[PDB]
Amino acid sequence: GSHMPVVHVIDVESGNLQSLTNAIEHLGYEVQLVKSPKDFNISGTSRLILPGVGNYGHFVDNLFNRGFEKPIREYIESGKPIMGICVGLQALFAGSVESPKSTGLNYIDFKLSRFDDSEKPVPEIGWNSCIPSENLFFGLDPYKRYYFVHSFAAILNSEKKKNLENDGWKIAKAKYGSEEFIAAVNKNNIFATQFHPEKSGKAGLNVIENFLKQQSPPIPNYSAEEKELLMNDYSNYGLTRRIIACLDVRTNDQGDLVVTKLGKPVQLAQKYYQQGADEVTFLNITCPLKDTPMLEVLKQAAKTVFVPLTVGGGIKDIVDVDGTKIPALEVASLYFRSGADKVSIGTDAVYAAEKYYELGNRGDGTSPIETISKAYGAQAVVISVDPKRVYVNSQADTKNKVFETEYPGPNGEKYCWYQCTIKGGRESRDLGVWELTRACEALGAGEILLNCIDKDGSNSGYDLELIEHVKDAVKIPVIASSGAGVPEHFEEAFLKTRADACLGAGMFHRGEFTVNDVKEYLLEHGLKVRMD
Ligand SMILES: NC(=O)c1ncn([C@@H]2O[C@H](COP(=O)(O)O)[C@@H](O)[C@H]2O)c1NCNCC(O)[C@H](O)[C@H](O)COP(=O)(O)O
Ligand code: NI
Structure with a gap:
């Protein structure tokens, strides 16, 4: 309760939460489940994780129904670390086409849309990579793979990437087929991933550890031989x-x-x-x-x-x-x-x-x-x-x-x-x-x-x-x-x-x-x- 760093995990009591909890404990932290806004106070929380799974509306409705909107915003306003996972990242947007009438925290002013199924299979299920960038964070390594499992994503174009850039957001991009989308976002104290780190093996555990310890370590010094082997060639749409x-x-x-x-x-x-x-x-x-x-x-x-x-x-x-x-x-x-x-x-x-x-x-x-x-x-x-x-x-x-x-x-x-x-x-x-x-x-x-x-x-x-x-x-x-x-x-x-x-x-x-x-x-x- 104080012998190890406590990590608050918001639990809407739906979906697999076992993996995230076990991953956090495996990293040497204690998990405190927050099923209600009454289960946590801002000053007593140093690490908050917003895990999401399933249909966008089914999640966001449940979350806001319990009265979590203001608590989450007040926490973000406090300047302390927050990590969103899957629908936890989608909730930061204006909403999603998966649930038209649902709303979002609207930190990013656009909606998530469905991947184009004319060129590839939808949902995207598999191991994809982050496109090499100068603005990567929390140890996101382009030569490693993370597990994605979604039909909807924040699909990008020049205009969107630029507005986000000028807005102060750091964007980890990924490509599935011919479509580029947000794999992860980072601005001030906000961090979120479209992929499931708790489902991404050691590479995933590292992302969680990096967020909990608030660090963006440099990517390993790979040789021109290692990079050429580990790089995404976009065969099988970018999935391994x-x-x-x-x-x-x-x-x-x-x-x-x-x-x-x-x-x-x-x-x-x-x-x-x-x-x-x-x-x-x-x-x-x-x-x-x-x-x-x-x-x-x-x-x-x-x-x-x-x-x-x-x-x-x-x-x-x-x-x-x-x-x-x-x-x-x-x-x-x-x-x-x-x-x-x-x-x-x-x-x-x-x-x-x-x-x-x-x-x-x-x-x-x-x-x-x-x-x-x-x-x-x-x-x-x-x-x-x-x-x-x-x-x-x-x-x-x-x-x-x-x-x-x-x-x-x-x-x-x-x-x-x-x-x-x-x-x-x-x-x-x-x-x-x-x-x-x-x-x-x-x-x-x-x-x-x-x-x-x-x-x-x-x-x-x-x-x-x-x-x-x-x-x-x-x-x-x-x-x-x-x-x-x-x-x-x-x-x-x-x-x-x-x-x-x-x-x-x-x-x-x-x-x-x-x-x-x-x-x-x-x-x-x-x-x-x-x-x-
Ligand atoms: N009594 C059984 O043998 C049996 N009962 C159920 N299953 C599988 O579990 C599924 C779920 O069962 P529900 O009917 O939904 O209750 C079925 O659809 C079925 O594929 C069964 N067997 C599995 N049958 C085929 C495979 O899926 C197999 O795992 C691969 O062919 C491996 O092949 P390999 O050894 O060649 O690598
Ligand atoms: Ni303790």
């Missing part, structure tokens, strides 16, 4: 080749949690993080909702794993042990507050998509995809697709969209579509992958986890045509999954397809290769990867 490590979570005979048919999933996640994983996905496949074992795994993993965590399995409307009807939104909220950054929807995604087409290509606003994305944004919803190839002689043989394949079927069929399955692949549905992804994308999904039942655990590579087929269908990031066995497979997916990321389960779990082994190979072949 994202390597995702995934693990299954099952319950054995005794009731304990294991990854092979509650410390094992936790320790493996820590290992994956220590060995270079850009993301860790937990597939829950294992009792009251509050006491769910998977929630505790997230909590434990979130203590040392400073990269985004995804959880999938059973995210839908449920009937708890006591009979209480808990909507999918509340289930996802529980997982988020427990350490998860994104939730994966499989079975309920196929249902929602079928319903979508029956209603004449519209949603009724009740599906997990719709409610979760409206509260936490599209970047918080992942669709887990579990497809299988079905051959046909022509488009006339099915209502589902087909494509011409390079690999003829058993009877010489030159066309095929991919059929969706539910409940761990135990049941098929008369819905194609083309129809499923497009539907879910419309309902609000922000990313597609594209598995392939035929390639699952085969270590023979990814289903390249499937990847390209889905990339033709949607404008949201698509993750290549199922089939990864060797580093060459990742390279193949990244060069021969438009895959926005690569996921691996078996190969990492077998210790055959580590995430770093895959990264070393990609780096050796000229691809950009996160190395921290």
Whole structure:
């Protein structure tokens, strides 16, 4: 309470706050959560952090509803250090197009807009860099990567950058595709980042430490060889080749949690993080909702794993042990507050998509995809697709969209579509992958986890045509999954397809290769990867 520096963190009791708290404590500070304006006074606060997550309006409304506007302004007026993270940075602006009627602190007199999806996938999900500048601050290093996860940003042009310049603002810029936007801002005692430092590994922890210690250390003295290797070449729109490590979570005979048919999933996640994983996905496949074992795994993993965590399995409307009807939104909220950054929807995604087409290509606003994305944004919803190839002689043989394949079927069929399955692949549905992804994308999904039942655990590579087929269908990031066995497979997916990321389960779990082994190979072949 006074034996270490206290850091006040504003808590609107929504989203993942575990990572930020753990990151601050890991730096040797004590965290004091401020859920109400009554929980903190100006003179008794030396370090204030305004963490934001989800939909702009859902955050700003909640924040101002609690009466935080004046306290925040009075704190900023006191001249003491404040750090805004994600929506914490967006709140400094006039508002956002994500929530038209919502307002902002208006320190920067313009609104955040949506990235152009005509040239790249929106939301931006991945590791981007700050463009080299003379006015960088708090240790922001152009040769390092930070994690961005957003659809809206403060998009720049000459006029805006100049007004901000003359206004006394220091701007850390970043580019996604052909669009330049604000990655971070700094003026007097105000600091804010569009990226999540608590999710950016060591590079991220350094940014937090630099703010808490109020220092702008010089960037390491890199050689012309190191710079040329670490610089952003703007391949894959400026995002590094994202390597995702995934693990299954099952319950054995005794009731304990294991990854092979509650410390094992936790320790493996820590290992994956220590060995270079850009993301860790937990597939829950294992009792009251509050006491769910998977929630505790997230909590434990979130203590040392400073990269985004995804959880999938059973995210839908449920009937708890006591009979209480808990909507999918509340289930996802529980997982988020427990350490998860994104939730994966499989079975309920196929249902929602079928319903979508029956209603004449519209949603009724009740599906997990719709409610979760409206509260936490599209970047918080992942669709887990579990497809299988079905051959046909022509488009006339099915209502589902087909494509011409390079690999003829058993009877010489030159066309095929991919059929969706539910409940761990135990049941098929008369819905194609083309129809499923497009539907879910419309309902609000922000990313597609594209598995392939035929390639699952085969270590023979990814289903390249499937990847390209889905990339033709949607404008949201698509993750290549199922089939990864060797580093060459990742390279193949990244060069021969438009895959926005690569996921691996078996190969990492077998210790055959580590995430770093895959990264070393990609780096050796000229691809950009996160190395921290
Ligand atoms: N009983 C199961 O086996 C099972 N049950 C659920 N899942 C996954 O979890 C998601 C969420 O489940 P909901 O239906 O939403 O409750 C599903 O969509 C599904 O992908 C299951 N298995 C996972 N199936 C495929 C993968 O996603 C796999 O992790 C990669 O193919 C790894 O491949 P690799 O070893 O080749 O690297
Ligand atoms: Ni103390």
